[PDB]
Design a protein around this ligand. Structure first.
Ligand SMILES: Cn1cncc1[C@@](N)(c1ccc(Cl)cc1)c1ccc2c(c1)c(-c1cccc(Cl)c1)cc(=O)n2C
Ligand SMILES: CC(C)=CCC/C(C)=C/CC/C(C)=C/COP(=O)(O)OP(=O)(O)O
Ligand SMILES: [K+]
Ligand SMILES: [Zn+2]
Lengths: 335, 446
């Protein structure tokens, strides 16, 4: 074995695997590990048991990670050693980048990145090529949930809401694929996400209020709202059946405390239907924001088009909405 | 086959001219699914029912699941930290298909004895630190096999102390000490807490107590509320993208805190949650996607599918011993699972073009089971206390196979009927009941 013959490791005795394959019945879902992985992990058990913080243990974690990057325990132990030994975290980041590029779908790598990057002593400000590395990941998988999650944390941590590369990178990704919902979600955070550092992080403003009012901004920048709505319309015109910009627009209007009827004419322009989202938009306008007579009937017409032609898999939801509108209109007629 | 509606035999009507990676992947997925939905692919086995849907290949899936509990070659090293999950997925699948898994008691005990840490909790295996997901998997596995000896395996007090270390000042839970904080962590932690009847109070020396918190549930529903997004769905952590997987974790966790019709409308905006959840389902595929503009996946038959009984209970209210009914397409989901997600050699898959695995086998079957039952909460609980009282009041009635057409029909056959699963605990109701009741009657260790 590698470790068992290395004088570097002579001072410590490995702890052999105990899977229960000797006591009682045979264990379930076993894996016939390679001799290399068996030996490395046996030495890992030994150093962790002794709480050893050393250069040799650090190298060991790197070796095990090279065999199995989904080993959650080894990453956490590695982070402990790095801080305990006062290792150069810039060098650790450069190494981590290479691991990330080899294992696109691994999320443990990205929690580890957050742990390191959160250290103000080592990273007082946003590293000059950090955003570039994120774009190198997004160029390979533009919707990577864990990389987007890390980028959200990065924005909050370094206060990058108005940093031009955040909005620039979002728009570059939306140029490449306007249907990238992850980019739209990040855009909402940049523009409308809560920033108060004295509060717990939240996806929406006003979580302390009634749930129906979740998202409402305390103070509204009206020019910014107009600009974001105009941007949304422009992207919609590129591909009207794309749900993401319609959902974003609903989010912006909710945050701004503006009614969906601000887009009534815009929605109608797609109706010969070029967008089912335009139909759903009109249904809500006629049902929830229009108090005139006949408006309820028109909402039901829109929902009928959806359930019969334009989105029939969601028939039971459309019908639920119809029943709600009918009851509401009946209550209105009653009083 | 005349029993297959046009809805499941053709691409959507509306088509944008602009082509991007998203539409290229979506188009390829639809094209792979179409011959299977139509029941004309040569990989498919019959018999086909009056709806044109192949039978659930019970024998093939049984053999697959039994084999998945045995030994794997060295190439499967990536699953080393997830071995408890592998035990759970297989036992769950076997239970669903109607097998008695009592005979696995001794082997389950042997597996998890080594993985339990003396400081508390269960990890992926010998020498791995405790993790809420491996503890969740181990507890559910123990629940399914049953028996006093399996129940006694867990060090309750140590588990309580360890779980206390995971409680964060913002109300959520990390998955392990030094690990990530996400709603998956909160859900797994609270299920373990509920099934073992752990004390509600945090350990007297828990770090979270320095942040004003006193119990495991303190600040928790507020944390979950801060995970809702502008889309209406729920993300893994605040500010992240809405995803079906985290929607289930969040909703199930809320329903562990009280009655669905009280807790869900209080902490979630149902007006935005409902259409987003509805929008998870595609035609012609019939299955659920996890997030906006991504692809259907058989495992979301559970993650998204089992959000529905929870949401519908929140709308209906507690049933004493009138419903909004099902707000999604049971026909569509059933078509996707049975027509598209069955592998000819056994096991179920994410989607056509993917190999089967025990994770996707477990959750596709779980989703198939949910469409076959009316799941509802009642005023009658098997718990002798009041904590998690609503969570142990869930009951079920069969939703029988249908005849003819309709918007809410059962297009599986009765030959395809699976055992009902608890919508929160994702094990049989009796299994969840037995383990909870047993621990309720045990004094907490000194
Ligand atoms: C995102 N996803 C959707 N379907 C399957 C996947 C997953 N990418 C995934 C990744 C992380 C997590 Cl917590 C849940 C699911 C996936 C993909 C294939 C999987 C596994 C998981 C896992 C797995 C491993 C550990 C945790 C869990 Cl919940 C699932 C097991 C397995 O054999 N395979 C083939
Ligand atoms: C209890 C339990 C562990 C809960 C969590 C289960 C759930 C499946 C976790 C993953 C969710 C999310 C990160 C998927 C993204 O990966 P992806 O991009 O590959 O998938 P996607 O395209 O469908 O979003
Ligand atoms: K996990
Ligand atoms: Zn899946």
């Amino acid at each position: 074995g590698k470790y068992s013959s290395d004088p570097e490791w002579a001072s410590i005795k490995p702890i052999e695997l105990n899977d229960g394959s000797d006591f009682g019945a045979m264990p379930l879902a076993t894996i016939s590990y390679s001799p290399e992985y068996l030996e490395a992990t046996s030495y890992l058990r030994a150093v962790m048991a002794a709480n050893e913080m050393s250069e040799r243990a650090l190298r060991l974690t790197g070796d095990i990670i090279s065999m199995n990057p989904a080993h959650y325990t080894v990453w956490i132990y590695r982070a402990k050693i790095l801080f305990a030994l006062g290792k150069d975290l810039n060098e650790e980041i450069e190494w981590l980048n290479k691991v990330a590029l080899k294992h696109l779908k691994n999320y443990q790598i990205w929690h580890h990145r957050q742990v390191l990057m959160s250290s103000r002593a080592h990273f007082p400000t946003l590293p000059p090529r950090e955003q570039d590395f994120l774009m190198e990941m997004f160029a390979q998988d533009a919707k990577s949930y864990h990389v987007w999650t890390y980028r959200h944390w990065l924005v909050r941590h370094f206060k990058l809401w108005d940093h031009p590369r955040e909005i620039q990178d979002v728009e570059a990704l939306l140029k490449a694929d306007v249907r990238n919902n992850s980019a739209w979600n990040h855009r909402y955070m940049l523009r409308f996400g809560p920033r108060d550092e004295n509060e717990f992080d939240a996806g929406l403003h006003n979580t302390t209020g009634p749930s129906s009012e979740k998202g409402r901004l305390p103070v509204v920048d009206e020019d910014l709202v107009d600009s974001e709505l105009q941007y949304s319309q422009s992207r919609i015109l590129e591909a009207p059946e794309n749900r993401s910009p319609w959902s974003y627009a609903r989010g912006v209007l909710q945050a701004a405390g503006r009614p969906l009827s601000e887009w009534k004419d815009f929605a109608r322009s797609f109706v010969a239907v070029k967008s089912s989202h335009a139909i759903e938009w009109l249904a809500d306008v006629y049902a929830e924001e229009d108090g005139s007579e006949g408006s309820a009937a028109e909402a039901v017409k829109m929902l009928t088009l959806l359930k019969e032609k334009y989105d029939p898999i969601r028939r039971n939801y459309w019908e639920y909405r119809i029943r709600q509108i009918t009851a509401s209109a009946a209550h209105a007629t009653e009083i | 086959h005349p029993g297959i509606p046009a809805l499941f035999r053709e691409p959507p009507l509306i088509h944008d001219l602009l082509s991007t990676e998203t539409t290229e992947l979506q188009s390829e997925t639809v094209n792979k699914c179409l011959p299977l939905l139509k029941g004309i692919h040569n990989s498919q086995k019959g018999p086909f029912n009056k709806y044109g849907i192949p039978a659930l290949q019970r024998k093939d899936h049984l053999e697959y699941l039994y084999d998945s509990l045995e030994d794997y070659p060295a190439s499967f090293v990536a699953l080393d930290a997830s071995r408890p999950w592998m035990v759970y997925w297989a036992l769950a699948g076997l239970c669903l298909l109607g097998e008695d898994v009592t005979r696995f008691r001794e082997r389950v005990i042997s597996t998890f004895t080594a993985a339990q840490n003396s400081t508390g909790g269960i990890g992926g295996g010998h020498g791995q630190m405790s993790h809420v997901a491996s503890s969740y998997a181990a507890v559910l596995s123990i629940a399914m096999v049953g028996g006093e000896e399996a129940f006694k395996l867990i060090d309750r007090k140590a588990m309580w102390k360890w779980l206390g270390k995971l409680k964060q000042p913002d109300g959520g839970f990390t998955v392990c000490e030094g690990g990530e904080e996400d709603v998956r962590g909160a859900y797994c932690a609270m299920v373990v807490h509920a099934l073992l009847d752990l004390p509600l109070a945090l350990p007297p020396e828990a770090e979270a107590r320095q942040n004003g918190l006193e119990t495991f549930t303190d600040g928790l529903p507020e944390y979950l509320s801060r995970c809702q997004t502008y889309e209406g769905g729920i993300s893994g952590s605040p500010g992240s993208e809405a995803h079906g997987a985290y929607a289930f974790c969040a909703l199930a966790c809320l329903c562990l805190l009280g009655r669905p019709e009280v807790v869900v409308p209080r902490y979630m905006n149902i007006a935005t949650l409902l259409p987003w959840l509805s929008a998870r389902q595609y035609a012609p595929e019939g299955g659920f996607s996890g997030r906006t503009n991504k692809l259907v996946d058989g495992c979301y038959s559970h993650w998204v599918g089992n959000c529905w009984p929870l949401v519908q209970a929140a709308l209906d209210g507690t049933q004493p011993l009138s419903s909004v009914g099902n707000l999604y397409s049971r026909e569509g989901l059933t078509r996707y699972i049975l027509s598209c997600c069955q592998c000819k050699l056994g096991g179920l898959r994410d989607k056509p073009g993917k190999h089967p695995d025990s994770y996707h086998t477990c959750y596709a079957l779980t989703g198939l089971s949910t469409v076959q039952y009316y799941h509802y909460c009642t005023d009658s609980s098997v718990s002798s206390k009041d904590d998690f009282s609503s969570a142990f009041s869930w009951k079920h009635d069969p939703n029988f196979a249908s005849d003819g057409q309709g918007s809410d029909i059962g297009v599986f056959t009765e030959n395809d009927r699976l055992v009902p699963f608890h919508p929160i605990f994702v094990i049989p109701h009796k299994s969840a009941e037995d383990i909870r009741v047993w621990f309720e009657n045990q004094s907490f260790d000194l």
